[PDB]
Amino acid sequence: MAESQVERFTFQAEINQLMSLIINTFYSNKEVFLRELISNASDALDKIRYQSLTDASVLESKTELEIKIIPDKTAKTLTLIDSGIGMTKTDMVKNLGTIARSGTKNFMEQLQSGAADISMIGQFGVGFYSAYLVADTVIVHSKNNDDEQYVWESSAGGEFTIALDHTEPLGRGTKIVLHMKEDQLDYLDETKIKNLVKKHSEFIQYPISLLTIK
Ligand SMILES: [Mg+2]
Incomplete structure (x- = not known):
């Protein structure tokens, strides 16, 4: 029998509001x-790369600096794995x-007014929550040199959980898993995701590996 300690957390009020706005509103793109x-x-x-310039030992946990993208139609997930710095619990x-993030309130105001559209979310310091445009549930596995591997999970609704993660060790970095909404499954199509990755990685200075599940 497996045992797990789980801790529940509540989203900051405006972040919760933003997640609701992202989930419950139609966006064409x-x-x-x-x-x-x-x-x-x-x-x-x-x-982690810049940390390695001043302390080379930080890379011992995983020498490669890379990104892996895994669309999985059977699982209805999109996964992105990096070997970056990772997050402690x-x-x-x-x-x-x-x-609280400084830009959350202002972003929601500009969305409501038309001053900003959803594509501009990153400018407001809340880019992470864009995952909820296409995913019902987001799971973030992460390993930082300073801590054990943990997993964060949320299906929104105002709360998230964090627990120790005993699934595949990352060595160092982050694995984010998007459980895709039924109406957003096209983003797992091989050509669609290949093109999107090309389009949104033009200036990325790390190797990207893109898998297709046969
Ligand atoms: Mg960001």
Whole structure:
């Protein structure tokens, strides 16, 4: 019998409102979700790479600096794995929903008015939540050199959980798994996702591997 300690957290009020707005509103073009996944991976890779310039030992946990993208139609998931800096448990708590972001209120105001559209979400410091444009549930597995591997999960509804993760060790970095909404499954089509990755990785300075499940 397996045992797991799970901790529940509540999203900061405006983040919760943003998630509701992202989930319960129609958006014609949701491609920004992929831009934001890749950008977060690139930022995490930069962070560990620059740390390695001043402390080479930080790469011992995983020498490669790369991104892997895995569309899986049977599972109805899109997965993106980076070997960036990773998040400790408290990093997840602080960065993935409990702490207010300066731009959340202003973004929602500009969405409501028409001053901004959904593609601009990254400019407002809340890009991560774009995953909920296309996914019902988001699962974030992460391993930072300073902590054990943890998994964050949320289907929105105002809460998320974090638990120790005993699934496939990452060595270092982050694996984000999007459980795709029925009406967004086209994003798992081989040519569609290949093109989207090309389009949204033009200036990315790390190798990307894109799988297709036969
Ligand atoms: Mg980001």
